[PDB]
Amino acid sequence: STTVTQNNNSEFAWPGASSWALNGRNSLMNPGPAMASHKEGEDRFFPLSGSLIFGKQGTGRDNVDADKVMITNEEEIKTTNPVATESYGQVATNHQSAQAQAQTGWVQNQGILPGMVWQDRDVYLQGPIWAKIPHTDGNFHPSPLMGGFGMKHPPPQILIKNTPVPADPPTAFNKDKLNSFITQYSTGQVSVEIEWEL
Amino acid sequence: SNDNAYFGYSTPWGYFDFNRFHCHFSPRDWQRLINNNWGFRPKRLNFKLFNIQVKEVTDNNGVKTIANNLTSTVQVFTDSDYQLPYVLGSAHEGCLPPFPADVFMIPQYGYLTLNDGSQAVGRSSFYCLEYFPSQMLRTGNNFQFSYEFENVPFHSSYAHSQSLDRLMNPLIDQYLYYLSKTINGAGVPMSMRGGGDDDDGVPMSMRGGGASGQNQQTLKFSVAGPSNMAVQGRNYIPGPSYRQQRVSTTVTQNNNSEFAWPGASSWALNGRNSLMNPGPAMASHKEGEDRFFPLSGSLIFGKQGTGRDNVDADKVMITNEEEIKTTNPVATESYGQVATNHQSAQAQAQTGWVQNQGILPGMVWQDRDVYLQGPIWAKIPHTDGNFHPSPLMGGFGMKHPPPQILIKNTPVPADPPTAFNKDKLNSFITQYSTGQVSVEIEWELQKENSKRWNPEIQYTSNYYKSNNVEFAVNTEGVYSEPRPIGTRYLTRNL
Amino acid sequence: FENVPFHSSYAHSQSLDRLMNPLIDQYLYYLSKTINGAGVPMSMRGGGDDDDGVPMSMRGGGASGQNQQTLKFSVAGPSNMAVQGRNYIPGPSYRQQRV
Amino acid sequence: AQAQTGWVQNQGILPGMVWQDRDVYLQGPIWAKIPHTDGNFHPSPLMGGF
Amino acid sequence: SNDNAYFGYSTPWGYFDFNRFHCHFSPRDWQRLINNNWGFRPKRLNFKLFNIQVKEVTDNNGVKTIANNLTSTVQVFTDSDYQLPYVLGSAHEGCLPPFPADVFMIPQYGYLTLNDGSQAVGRSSFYCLEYFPSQMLRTGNNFQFSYE
Amino acid sequence: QKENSKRWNPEIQYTSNYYKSNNVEFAVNTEGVYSEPRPIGTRYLTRNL
Amino acid sequence: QKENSKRWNPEIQYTSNYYKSNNVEFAVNTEGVYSEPRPIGTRYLTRNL
Amino acid sequence: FNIQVKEVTDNNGVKTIANNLTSTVQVFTDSDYQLPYVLGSAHEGCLPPFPADVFMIPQYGYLTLNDGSQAVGRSSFYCLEYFPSQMLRTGNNFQFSYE
C-alpha cells in the first residue's frame, strides 16, 4: 500500500517477494506475468514486484521516497488477466463423501491451460521498445516481460571507441605493450530513423 | 499391482530398430560431430535387407544339424501408414549393435491396447500383421526403401556461455527502481528537562505510555544497479519444473528407508500411477554438488555386461544434465517462491515454495541432451493438442517418424496327414533366417560461427596409459562404451 | 470458415502409459532399492550374545541403529511398466470436486 | 529427513504434454469466437467445438 | 551475497542505445499515436554517425586545454551476427535523451559469462571487440547502416 | 476425414436399442413433442496413439 | 590438409579446463594483461606410419 | 595506414605533443633480399598476440664478418637510404602482396 500505515511493521521487501531460482541463485520476479495491479478502486495498492517504476526528474539512486518515483498502473488488462496480488482461483483438494466435506485450496500460481486468453504488459513512453529472444530450444509467447517487441534478430548492437593514440615512445626498443597514451575524447551527431506501421 | 496391469498381444513377427545414435555414429564420428557443430538433424534414410539365408534345423536323437532351405521365404513390410502400434522410441533393447562386427538377434514384436486390470474393454484393438501386404523373398532377393525425415528443428549441440539471470551490462544501472525498504527507523523515546526519562516495554497506558510500539514503516526505492543484479528487471524467465527427489551417490547421506517409489515424482492416468522417469529437462544439481542426482534422474545406461536387477551404482552410468543450468531450473530444487497472502498492519508477508511450475509467457529453456547410446527420434502421439512435442527422453519428435520394419519367417508345414482335417496345422519345420541390414542416414549440420577468443571445451580421450583403449574391444573381444557422451561442448551466447 | 483443425471423432485404442513393446526391456535403468539389509548383531565364542534395543553406549552398545542404505538399479522391463521412461506425459489438469 | 511428496492439484502445460479436447455433442455448440487478445493457448473452445 | 555473484569483462568500447520510446516519439507524437491507433510496430531502421570531432586534452600544471586532433580516428562496427553478448533490452541507462537539445555521454560496454561465485568456469567466454572488422573514421567521415 | 484403420475386430458403433418400447428414440411424442433421449458424442471409432 | 582417418576410438583434442578458476585461460587479467598460460603444439590428431 | 606524425616540444620540462601534418614516413620492402635477413631469428617485437595491445616497432640492426671486434675486408656495410622507398604523409597508405 501507498498509505504506509497499512503495511506490516517489518522488512519484507525481499523476504516476502516472489522469486525464481536458477542454479542456486534467486532472482526477484521483478516484472512477472502481466497481471492487473489491483482490484477495483483499491488504487493505493501495487504488486511488490510491481508495475515498472521510473524515477521522476533528478530523483536519486538509493532509498528514495515514494513521491520521487512513478509506479506504472497495469489496470486496463483486468478484463482478461488475473489480479497480481490475488489468487488465480480455487481447486478441489479431496473427495467429498458421507464422512468428509468438500475442500478447496488457493491457486497461488497457474501455468498455461488450453483455453487461456490474456493481454501482454503495456508499453510506455519511457519504456523499452524491443528485446532479444534468447536463442534456446524452447520458449513460450516470447513477448518481453518488461513490455515491448521480442525478436530473434533485434536491432544490432552499435559499438564505438576512440582509437588509442600512443604518447612519445622511448627511443630504445621495449617489448612491453605501450601504456602511455594521448588523452582524447570524441563528439558528433547520431541519427535514428524508424518507420512504424499503424 | 494395478500400476503394472496391461492387456495386449505378442506376435511371431520381429522388427528392425536402429533408433539409437551409436547405430549410425562411431565414437570417433560422434566426437567430430560434438566438437565442431552447433546443431544437427536427420534428413533422409535408406534401408536395405539382403543376402537372406533361410536355414532348416533337424534334431534327431539330440543330434542337431542345420541345412539351407533354398525354397523358403521371409516376409517383410513397412508400416508406412502408422496403422500398427508404434513400438520404436520407447528406449527398447534389440537395436543394431554399436560395434559393426557384432551379430544381433531381431527383437520380437508385441503391443498393448486398452485394459481394465488384466481385461480388455470393447475399444481394445487386435491387429493381425498378416492382414498387411508384404514382400516375400527367398535367398537371392533384396528388400529396400527410402524415407524422408519431416522438418525437425536442429538439436542444440551447444551449452550457453551465459545464464538467464546474468544478461545485463555489469557497468550500467537500469532506469527502473525497486522497493528496497519497507521499514525505516524505530520507535522513539524523546527528550525534555535536563533529567532523562526513557519509555520502556511493559509501561501501561494507565501509567502514561499511550504510545503504540512501532511506526517505522516507509517506502524507499533504489535503482537496480550492477551492485544488486538479483533485483534487476528481466524480460525472460527460466523454463518449467516438476521437483524431483534428490539422491546422493555417497549412500550414508541418504535417509535410512525405502523411498525409491514412495518419494518418487509421478503422474496419474485413469487410476494408474507412472513414475516421472525422465521428466521436464532440468539441471541435475546445484554448482559443485556433483554427488547428487534426481531420483527420477538423468537417463541411466548400464555398463557393459551389467545385470538386469538390483545392480550396484558402479555398474551403471547416470547421465548429467548440467549444461542446461543456464536456462532450466534445477530438478531437485523449487522453481521459486510466491506470495500467499496480503501483508498488512496485522499480518506479515508470507511466501510459499513452487514445487512445480507450468509454462508462463516469457519462459525460455533447453531440451534434454542426446547421447551416443541415447534414442534418436520418437512418434508424436496423434492427439488434438500437445506442447513442444520434443521427446522427453531426448531426440527428435515427428508425427511421421521412420516407419516400423516388420520381418518374419514364413511358416513351412511339416508332413500333413494323408486324410483331410479342418484343424489349422500346428506341425512346422523348425527354421530361422539370417542376412545383412544397411541403414544410411543423411544428417544436416549447423556449423559453429563463434567469435569467442579463448579455446572451447572439447570431448577428448585420456592420454594416461591404461590396460584397454576407450571405445575399443576387450581381450575377450567384448566391445564396450566406457561412458555416456552428450553433444553440448561448444558454447554460444543466450 | 477459416482453417480450423478437424474435430477428433475417435477414441484412442491405447493409453499414454501403455505404448511400449510388452516383450522387450528398455536399455534404461531405474533406482529400485535405497535400503539393503539391516542392522547386524554378529557372533563370537560358542555362547551367543545379541545386541538389543535400549543398550547404552555406556553398556558397550556404541553401534548406531542402521546402515542399510544402498543404491540398486534395475532394467525397466515388461514386468514393471509403471517405472519405464516415456517421451510424452498426460495433459494439464485443474482438480474438480467429485459428486 | 525422509523423502516427502505433495499432491499436484492443478498442473499447467509442460513441454512433452499430449491431450484430447472436449468432445462435441449433437445438442452441443459448434463454434466460438476466439477473444481478440495479445496471447492465448490452444484456443479450442472449452465447451467443445471449433 | 551469492544471489549477486557474477563474472565478466569491462571493455573500453562504448555503445549506442535508443531502445526507449521517448528516443523517437515526442510527447505530442505519443499522444497522437495513443489516441488514434489500435496497434503499431517498427518495420525499418536507419542509423547514422557524422560530424565526428576527435579532441585532444592537454593538462600542464593544472592548466587544461582542448585542441582538435584532425588525424585521430574513431572505430565503429555493428554486431550484425549477434556474436557479442546482447546488452540492449535490459532497461539500461544511457539511451538517447528524450529531449533533442540534451547532449549525452555514450555508455561503456561490459558483459557477463558463466560464473561460480566470483570465479569463471571452463565454459566462460572472453570476447575481444578488436577481433571484429570495424570502420575507422576521422572527422569528415560518416557511418550509417539500415535494419529490417 | 474418413477412417482408414487396420484393426481386425469390429469397432464400437452408436446404435438404437432394438428392444420394444412405447415411443421411438429421437421421434415425436403422441402429443407431437420431439425429444432427444440422450447426448451423443462423436468418439466411437478408435485410432492408435 | 584435412584429416581422413578410419580410427574407431576418439582422438586426443586440445581443450580448456572446465574446473573453476580465478581467470580465464588465454584471456585478460583484472589489470588488463593478456597472457598465454601455456605453449600449444599442433600434434593432437593421429595417423599411421 | 592512418599514419600520424607527431612532433614533441619540451620547454622547461613542460612536454607537449602536436601533429606535424607535412612530415613523412619512409617505407620499403627488401623484395630482392639484398639486406641481411633479420626475421626468423626468434626476435622480440612482433605484432602482439592480443589485438588491443599497442606495440613499438623494433629497431633494425645487422652483423657482417668479424675478426674479434674488428671487421675484415669482406665485411659489408649497407645503407637503407640507398634503396628506393615510398614516402607518405598522413592520408597516404602503403600495401603490397606476397606469394
- Residue B33 DSSP class: H
Interchain proximity F46–C11, CB inside 8 Å: yes
Judge contact between H45 and A175, C-beta under 8 A: yes
Pairing of strands H6-11, H14-19: antiparallel
Judge contact between D24 and F43, C-beta under 8 A: no
- For the CA atoms of B154, B158, B159, B160, the dihedral, rounded to the nearest 10 degrees, stands at -70
Question: What residue type is E71 in one-letter code?
Answer: T
Closest-CA residue to A130 (of E93, E83, B172, E20): E20
Residue showing cell 518374419: B408
Closest-CA residue to B156 (of B44, B40, B27, B239): B40
Rounded to 5 degrees, φ, ψ at A22 are: -130, 100
CA end-to-end span of chain F, whole Å? 17
Burial of E146 (0-12, 13-18, 19+ CB in 10 A): exposed
Most B CBs within 10 Å, among C6, C9, C24, to test the B interface: C24
Our CA-based measurement puts residue D40 at a distance from the nearest CA of chain F, in whole angstroms, of 26
Reading the block at residue H32, the C-alpha cell is 630482392
Between B126, B131, B382, which is nearest F47 by CB? Answer: B382
D43 touches chain B (CB under 8 A): no
**Residue H55: half-sphere exposure toward Cβ, Cα within 13 Å:** 13
Residue showing cell 492408435: F48
Chains that touch B (3 or more CB pairs under 8 A): A, C, D, E, F, G
Rounded to 5 degrees, φ, ψ at H24 are: -120, 165
Chains F and G, touching by 3 or more CB pairs within 8 angstroms: no
Chain C window 2-31: which residues touch F at a Cβ cutoff of 8 Å?
6-16, 19
Reading the block at residue B37, the C-alpha cell is 557443430
CB atoms within 10 A of CB E58: 16
Chain B window 475-494: which residues touch C at a Cβ cutoff of 8 Å?
none
Length in residues, chain G? 49
Judge contact between B256 and D3, C-beta under 8 A: no
Our CA-based measurement puts residue B85 at a distance from the nearest CA of chain F, in whole angstroms, of 6
Interchain proximity B131–F6, CB inside 8 Å: yes
Interchain proximity B112–C14, CB inside 8 Å: yes
Interchain proximity F7–B122, CB inside 8 Å: no
Let me know the angle formed at the C-alpha of B165 by E20 and A87, rounded to the nearest 5 degrees. Answer: 85
CB atoms within 10 A of CB H14: 11
The helix (H) or strand (E) run that includes residue B244 is none
Between B123, B131, B383, which is nearest F8 by CB? Answer: B131
Chain A residues with CB-CB distance to H17 below 8 A: 167-168, 182
The helix (H) or strand (E) run that includes residue B223 is strand B217-223
Pairing of strands B431-447, B108-112: unpaired
- Give the integer Cα–Cα distance in Å for B331 and B327: 12
**Residue A37: half-sphere exposure toward Cβ, Cα within 13 Å:** 20
Interchain proximity D43–A117, CB inside 8 Å: yes
Interchain proximity C95–D10, CB inside 8 Å: yes
Let me know the angle formed at the C-alpha of E105 by E101 and E110, rounded to the nearest 5 degrees. Answer: 145
Burial of B123 (0-12, 13-18, 19+ CB in 10 A): middle
CB atoms within 10 A of CB F3: 11
- Give the integer Cα–Cα distance in Å for B394 and B319: 12
Chain D residues with CB-CB distance to F41 below 8 A: 23-25
Chains that touch A (3 or more CB pairs under 8 A): B, C, D, E, H
Interchain proximity G21–E120, CB inside 8 Å: yes
Listed in sequence order, the residues at least 6 apart from G21 whose beta carbon sits closer than 8 Å to its beta carbon are E119, E120
Closest-CA residue to B100 (of A61, G34, G8, H81): G8
Our CA-based measurement puts residue D38 at a distance from the nearest CA of chain A, in whole angstroms, of 5
The helix (H) or strand (E) run that includes residue A184 is strand A184-197
Reading the block at residue D10, the C-alpha cell is 492443478
Nearest residue in H to A166, CA atom:
H54
Reading the block at residue B346, the C-alpha cell is 496485522
Judge contact between D47 and D29, C-beta under 8 A: yes
Q: Across the strands, what pairs with E119?
A: E116
Chain E residues with CB-CB distance to A27 below 8 A: 3
Coil, strand or helix at B283 = strand
Q: Give me the numbers of helices (H) and strands (E) for chain G, helices first please.
A: 0, 0
Our CA-based measurement puts residue B67 at a distance from the nearest CA of chain C, in whole angstroms, of 30
Question: How does DSSP assign H5-25, residue by residue?
Answer: -EEEEEETTEEEEEE-TT--E
Q: How far is CA H61 from the centre of its chain?
A: 10
Which technique was the structure solved with, according to the deposited record?
cryo-EM
Chains A and H, touching by 3 or more CB pairs within 8 angstroms: yes
Residue showing cell 551389467: B306
Nearest residue in A to C97, CA atom:
A92
Chain E residues with CB-CB distance to H50 below 8 A: 128, 130
- Residue E88 DSSP class: S
Q: What is the CA radius of gyration of chain D?
A: 17
Q: What is the CA radius of gyration of chain A?
A: 26
Pairing of strands C69-75, B377-379: unpaired
Closest-CA residue to A145 (of B163, B234, B175): B234
Chains C and G, touching by 3 or more CB pairs within 8 angstroms: no
Interchain proximity H14–E61, CB inside 8 Å: yes
Chain B window 342-371: which residues touch A at a Cβ cutoff of 8 Å?
342-352, 354, 357-367
Residue showing cell 464422512: A99
Question: Å resolution of this model?
Answer: 3.2
Burial of B255 (0-12, 13-18, 19+ CB in 10 A): middle
Coil, strand or helix at B486 = coil
Judge contact between D16 and B361, C-beta under 8 A: no
- For the CA atoms of B181, B183, B189, B194, the dihedral, rounded to the nearest 10 degrees, stands at 0
Interchain proximity G20–E123, CB inside 8 Å: no
